[PDB]
Amino acid sequence: WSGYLDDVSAKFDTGVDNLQTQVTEALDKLAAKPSDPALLAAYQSKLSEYNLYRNAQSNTVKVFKDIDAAIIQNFR
Amino acid sequence: DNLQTQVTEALDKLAAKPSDPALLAAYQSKLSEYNLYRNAQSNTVKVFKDIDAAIIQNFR
Amino acid sequence: SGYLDDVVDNLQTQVTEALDKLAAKPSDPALLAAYQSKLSEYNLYRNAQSNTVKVFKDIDAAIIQNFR
Amino acid sequence: MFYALYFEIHHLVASAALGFARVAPIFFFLPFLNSGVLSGAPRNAIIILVALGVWPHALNEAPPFLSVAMIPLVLQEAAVGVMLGCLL
Amino acid sequence: LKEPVIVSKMAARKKITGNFEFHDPNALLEKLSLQLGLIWYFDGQAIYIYD
Amino acid sequence: PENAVIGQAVNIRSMETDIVSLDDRLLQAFSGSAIATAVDKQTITNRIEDPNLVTDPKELAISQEMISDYNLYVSMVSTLTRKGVGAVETLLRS
Amino acid sequence: VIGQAVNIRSMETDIVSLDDRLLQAFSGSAIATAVDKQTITNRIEDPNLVTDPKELAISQEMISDYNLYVSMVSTLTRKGVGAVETLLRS
Amino acid sequence: VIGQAVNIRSMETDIVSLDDRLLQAFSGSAIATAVDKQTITNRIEDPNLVTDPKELAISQEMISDYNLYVSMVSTLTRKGVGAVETLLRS
Amino acid sequence: TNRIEDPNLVTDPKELAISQEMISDYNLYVSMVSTLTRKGVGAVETLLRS
Amino acid sequence: MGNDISLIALLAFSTLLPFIIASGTCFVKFSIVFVMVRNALGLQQIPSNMTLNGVALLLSMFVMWPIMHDAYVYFEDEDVTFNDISSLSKHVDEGLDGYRDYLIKYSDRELVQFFENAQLKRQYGEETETVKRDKDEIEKPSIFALLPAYALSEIKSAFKIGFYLYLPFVVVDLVVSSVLLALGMMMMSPVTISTPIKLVLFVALDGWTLLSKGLILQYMDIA
Amino acid sequence: MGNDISLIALLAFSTLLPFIIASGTCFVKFSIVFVMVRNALGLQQIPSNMTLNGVALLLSMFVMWPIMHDAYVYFEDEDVTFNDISSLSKHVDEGLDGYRDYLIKYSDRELVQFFENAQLKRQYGEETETVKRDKDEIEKPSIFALLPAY
Amino acid sequence: ASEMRNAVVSLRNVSLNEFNNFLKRSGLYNKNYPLRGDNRKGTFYVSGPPVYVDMVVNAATMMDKQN
Amino acid sequence: ASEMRNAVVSLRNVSLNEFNNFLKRSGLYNKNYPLRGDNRKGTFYVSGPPVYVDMVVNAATMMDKQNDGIELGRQKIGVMRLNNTFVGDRTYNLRDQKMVIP
Amino acid sequence: YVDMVVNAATMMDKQNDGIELGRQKIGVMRLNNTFVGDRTYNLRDQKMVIPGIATAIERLLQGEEQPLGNIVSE
Amino acid sequence: ASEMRNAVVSLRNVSLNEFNNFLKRSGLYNKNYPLRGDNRKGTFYVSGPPV
Ligand SMILES: CCCCCCCCCCCC[N+](C)(C)[O-]
């Protein structure tokens, strides 16, 4: 049972439906045949997309914590 | 609650496709504006009620 | 606790559990991203509680002083 | 146990406060203690010191009255103090 | 009138005397409204009267 | 509700009648104030224990107001009570 | 939407159970029980728990409440003595 | 600019006693205060004004002036009442 | 003040580590004296005004 | 809560409250009357002033309550919000009429009018003359004029009562001396005998009940 | 913690205590009789006012202290429950009946009734008084009506 | 009589004709205090005894969210 | 009598007829204060003695959140044969070149 | 009685939350009429690839959130 | 007698049959105030003198 910064993370995790598994799959295939340019071309896309997903998620949760901490500071 | 609604819409559209630069560019703006709005509101609420407390403390 | 004396789960448990899980593999992004938001929500809760307890005690101290 | 000295000081002041109720009326009656003679900042400082000099129980253990309605108790003690002031 | 009637507090201060015939209430009510200085309305459930 | 507006036909007030005693008029005040304050304190506490309230800016902005209004209310009741007993004391010692 | 309810006719108070806890200034038994626990402890469990944020948030309540209780008794005794002196002079 | 109007002529009154001079000074201050508070509240919620540096630079001053003015009126009122109380006690 | 102007002293890491201590000691000394004098006069007020 | 200035006004009023009660209320009359009765009976310490003033304050509360309640209800009313200084000030003024009309029954017209003449702005020649119609002049003289005229007239009316209270005891005091002289016991002090007679007379007359009732009847109307 | 309004009520009560004692307690009688007898014996300042007031005060406590203690024992009672401002008012009023009875015993019914009328009848457009049958009002004269009559 | 209450309500999903029917099946319907409005639209006016007005305003405004 | 209490309740997952049956099996039903509403919908009104009203409102609100895990939206597969054209993307070879149509 | 019932019920409830009740099963299904694997044909001037049943079904279901039902031609 | 006390206790690793044996070997067991519960499960009720 969870707060509102979990609602904000989960909006990304349910937003990018399947990427979290698709990456592992792509790696399982590439590991078997590193010299295949079609596999290499696919993996570059998945790994880049995943890198951006994680950065945008973490910076958004940071910003909402900065808004909340400032409101709470005024309860004095 | 218009500026509260706009930011939650923008967030859904972004979460749908986190790598689209047009969506990122829009969300940056919406989130920044919301961020300034909240702070301004909280600070003025504080000032208005510190004045009342100082009045009561003056006769108390 | 396992104990009730006759006469859900809180953020304090959830943080201790997520830290415990993370410390087994400090380099997994799913676990890190799951822990950032629990440590943040625990920090906010534990500040807001103490600030309001402080407000209620200053109210009662002012009453007693006003009737001195 | 870390906070024990802090609580031990608060037990002291609660005992002194309940002793003042019984010692101060005597200071009101006697001709060399009344406020025609002893007044200002010395007055409380001395009354409190005497009350602590005569309180009967070890000062460092919790006062027994925490469970009781305070007003009936304070009036009881003040009445006793008035009776002693008359007899002295 | 076959309806409940509500009278505003400020109107309730006024006084009236005499012998009256309630033969046609709507026609009596409007005439007295004009003579006494009242205003009135009807929502379909209750009659409201104000100064 | 938000999609509804609800009035009062005309606000007659039976409690504008003075008819009760000067002491019943006191007991009403005391009883109502004591209940109002206990309810407010409880509500504020719940709004902090519950994790979805204490972590959403929309909810925090409201809790800030609740806390301040509570503070002002109690401080004013205390002040006026002191002023009241102080008047009695001033007259009777004169 | 889910589980919604509202009480229409009367303001029956429900956020709290109305109780004799309205009619007292200090829960002196709750003080006497907490003060017991933080004073019977002499060389059992451990000292120096300046540092855990969960117990450190329980100490804040006690450290405040006992200071208020002691401050209140100091005023009540002065008032009582002053009332006796007021009557005896007058 | 658009949809704007100003009241040219103020209504007027006689002022013949200290009573009316007092009620007049009171009424004059009450309204100015209410108007200022409302104005500030609106300036905090029009989003063209909350987010523009030129408009924020103004709102800052308006808030300050409000604070100072109400603190002055409070202080001088309490000083006057204290002078009356002191003389009558003496 | 003179240490802050000699360009040799103001730009050498060795010398700055000294200036920082000197300014921290000056600050604590003056705060101490200004506190104890206020307590000292407060005692006289308490005895005479009371 | 509300307008910050309305709050200041409420707190100022509540600070000045005891001086108003002590200077513009029937408490002034009852306080005097009871002490004069004690002096007429010839007691120097009985009852205490702390008892007499307590009674006087309670009796005054009945007389004054209805006005405070009416004025409170009049201001705790959301009816309107105000456009202008003249509308607000005339709304304020219309709330005090109940008190103004209480003071008007007991202050004296000529003294009131003299004080109203006193407030007007000075002139270099003697002030330009006027006569004003009743709705100001009879109905609405200013409170800063009414208040001292009230205080003074009350004091006067109190002394008057005390005078009547003394007369029967003076009669007693004389008669008893004349009878002792008729018996020749010229040297005995008559105070030793007159005092108990006075007490007997006052209890048989039940003076406390009569005073407490009639004083209230002067202001209330009871049926 | 407790309740912040019951705290105000406690501190307020303790400031008014000496005026209540001085105006609504047998102290009123005891302090008078002694001073009268002293004047009748014809030698003021023997006994001292200190002696007389001290004794009168002590004796008054035997009469009044049980009533106050009974009231606090009534309020410190963990089994009650309430639902509304009315249900609380009733229970608080019920707590004071122990004192009310003492005042009713030692005071005049008709002067009490007179003040009971005078609190209201400036409000009233009518002469009838029967309109409440006595059994409630005879039990419940207000305390502010009882005090000066006592 | 002086206690009559009234309210004005606007429904974003449920037509007046949809609601009257519900009241009939419930047996809450009361021909002395009918609702007043356009059966086709979703806005109406109602007045009556306070428990009735409050019941109506709450039922309609919850069911507007259920649908 | 004056102590009667009244409330309006608006479930999401549990139809009125679903709740009546629970009351009956429980032996808690009371024909003097029945629930009033539409057996088909989920909104109803209840009035009666305090204990009864409170029990009803509590039980209903717990039932509602319990049944909330029920998943009701489901996907289906439809198979469709073409009779007059090739299903896949279609290649022709010109004299030297393949060319392809969607 | 009430307090014992309440606490016993709540703690027995909590002691079961960790228990998992779902399960997975494996079905082995022989194809009676066609080759399971993807087919490929090599021709003088052409190469052709045809996906198998497993390939097509997987490519259809990949990423699906909802349960299935009604296939048509606690 | 009015100092009797009650509790409910819920074990996560051990089970009631495991714990009775401990009390037995300790010589602590008391047939007047036995533990009440399901020997297979890990939750039980106990009532008795404070110690
Ligand atoms: C002297 C006042 C302070 C102590 C309180 C005394 C309360 C009255 C006790 C009287 C007991 C008389 N007795 C034994 C005959 O019941």
PDB file of C-alpha atoms in Angstrom, chain O residues 4-47:
ATOM      1  CA  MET O   4      -5.816 -11.526  35.314  1.00  0.00           C
ATOM      2  CA  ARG O   5      -4.501 -10.624  31.854  1.00  0.00           C
ATOM      3  CA  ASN O   6      -5.091 -11.829  28.277  1.00  0.00           C
ATOM      4  CA  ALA O   7      -3.209 -11.830  24.987  1.00  0.00           C
ATOM      5  CA  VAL O   8      -3.190 -13.230  21.457  1.00  0.00           C
ATOM      6  CA  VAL O   9       0.136 -14.237  19.929  1.00  0.00           C
ATOM      7  CA  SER O  10       1.110 -15.151  16.375  1.00  0.00           C
ATOM      8  CA  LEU O  11       4.318 -17.022  15.534  1.00  0.00           C
ATOM      9  CA  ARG O  12       5.892 -17.080  12.091  1.00  0.00           C
ATOM     10  CA  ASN O  13       8.594 -19.789  12.252  1.00  0.00           C
ATOM     11  CA  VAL O  14       7.774 -21.965  15.282  1.00  0.00           C
ATOM     12  CA  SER O  15       4.494 -23.729  16.059  1.00  0.00           C
ATOM     13  CA  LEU O  16       2.389 -24.387  19.093  1.00  0.00           C
ATOM     14  CA  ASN O  17       3.403 -28.018  19.416  1.00  0.00           C
ATOM     15  CA  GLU O  18       7.021 -26.875  19.236  1.00  0.00           C
ATOM     16  CA  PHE O  19       6.482 -24.402  22.042  1.00  0.00           C
ATOM     17  CA  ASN O  20       4.530 -26.592  24.472  1.00  0.00           C
ATOM     18  CA  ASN O  21       7.481 -28.987  24.562  1.00  0.00           C
ATOM     19  CA  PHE O  22       9.739 -26.107  25.551  1.00  0.00           C
ATOM     20  CA  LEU O  23       7.471 -25.142  28.437  1.00  0.00           C
ATOM     21  CA  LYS O  24       7.360 -28.794  29.517  1.00  0.00           C
ATOM     22  CA  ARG O  25      11.123 -29.293  29.653  1.00  0.00           C
ATOM     23  CA  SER O  26      11.385 -25.919  31.401  1.00  0.00           C
ATOM     24  CA  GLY O  27       8.901 -27.060  34.030  1.00  0.00           C
ATOM     25  CA  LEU O  28       6.896 -23.865  33.420  1.00  0.00           C
ATOM     26  CA  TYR O  29       3.794 -25.507  31.959  1.00  0.00           C
ATOM     27  CA  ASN O  30       0.634 -25.138  34.059  1.00  0.00           C
ATOM     28  CA  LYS O  31      -2.465 -27.203  33.267  1.00  0.00           C
ATOM     29  CA  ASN O  32      -4.636 -24.501  34.850  1.00  0.00           C
ATOM     30  CA  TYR O  33      -3.686 -21.891  32.227  1.00  0.00           C
ATOM     31  CA  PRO O  34      -2.841 -23.792  29.031  1.00  0.00           C
ATOM     32  CA  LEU O  35      -2.309 -22.244  25.619  1.00  0.00           C
ATOM     33  CA  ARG O  36      -5.432 -22.398  23.437  1.00  0.00           C
ATOM     34  CA  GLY O  37      -5.114 -22.847  19.687  1.00  0.00           C
ATOM     35  CA  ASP O  38      -4.379 -25.155  16.749  1.00  0.00           C
ATOM     36  CA  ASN O  39      -1.300 -27.290  17.391  1.00  0.00           C
ATOM     37  CA  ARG O  40      -0.565 -27.444  13.660  1.00  0.00           C
ATOM     38  CA  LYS O  41      -0.795 -23.670  13.219  1.00  0.00           C
ATOM     39  CA  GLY O  42       1.092 -20.794  14.764  1.00  0.00           C
ATOM     40  CA  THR O  43      -1.472 -18.596  16.463  1.00  0.00           C
ATOM     41  CA  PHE O  44      -2.888 -18.944  19.938  1.00  0.00           C
ATOM     42  CA  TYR O  45      -4.554 -17.284  22.907  1.00  0.00           C
ATOM     43  CA  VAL O  46      -3.243 -17.112  26.474  1.00  0.00           C
ATOM     44  CA  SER O  47      -4.708 -15.793  29.717  1.00  0.00           C
TER      45      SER O  47
END
